Design a protein around this nucleic acid. Sequence first.
DNA 1: ATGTGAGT
DNA 2: AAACTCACAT
Length: 327
Amino acid sequence: ETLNGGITDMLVELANFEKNVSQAIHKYNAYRKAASVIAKYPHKIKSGAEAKKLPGVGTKIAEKIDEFLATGKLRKLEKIRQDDTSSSINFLTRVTGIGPSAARKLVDEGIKTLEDLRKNEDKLNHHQRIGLKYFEDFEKRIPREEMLQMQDIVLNEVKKLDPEYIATVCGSFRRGAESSGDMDVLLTHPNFTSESSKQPKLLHRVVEQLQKVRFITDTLSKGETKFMGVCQLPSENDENEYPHRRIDIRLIPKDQYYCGVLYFTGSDIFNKNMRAHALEKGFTINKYTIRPLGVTGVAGEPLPVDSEQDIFDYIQWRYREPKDRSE
DNA sequence: ATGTGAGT
DNA sequence: AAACTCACAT
Ligand SMILES: [Cl-]
Ligand SMILES: [Cl-]
Ligand code: NA
Ligand code: NA
């Protein structure tokens, strides 16, 4: 719904101005919740007062709605669209590692373009310099044919270290997408549960090998359970390298792995439906666990899971292939 | 120990 | 959406 898009768009764009330029997080928040409550409203809104009945929509927002409905525009929006102070902050913000905070400082000093940046790397940190360096490759989509190539290399290396490992390339790729933005891997092993020790080596060991075999080129962060970095498909000669690609790797305890794989597969709206449908049956679902709900209305003790199928079974839904998870 | 920042 | 992991400065 699909009938009030003009107002919500206006709202998310006002939300974004507050975060990037005003750095006023409460106004940003109001704008976001006001947008989402309106996007689930059944009727086409014909005035500010009508909208105000919704919880989260108040005086000021109802006033802008009047203006928008009468002019098709909002002066505050048009004003800031012309102002180059914010167009700059928004552009710099497109570099992985640069947010509203770093963005402000740079433009105050006069730094506004990629060319400007490449002359001022001393004002950047590691992560930010890897962002500047590969700003273009990153902004490129990645052809599924390549994904299937990357997938091989990691899973294959993994099995060779310890056959007991389990590794799963998630995201819209798994759903069957024609392409995507980055590569996301979920990893586990039987020695690692939510009740056992704390082996950090399990991740580290698989990260090193990939570096040894020249698959991982750079690092943005690396801890006991999460890795964020850079990989690139290898080239037959020197001639034409592939674009550099982003890749995260995440270690998960065996008892929580498949709730994980479900979550990071989506779709976002699928997760909405499932979490919904898996509520009325009498359960709760998340990144980690599934619990049964109490007669009074409270969850407790995770049920046992050892496959995707197990989750569908509990909520009396039939398993659905990744393909059919867009909606 | 704490706070700010950034990404998923 | 939001809770969680890591980086950097204090
Ligand atoms: Cl708030
Ligand atoms: Cl610095
Ligand atoms: Na960014
Ligand atoms: Na994807």
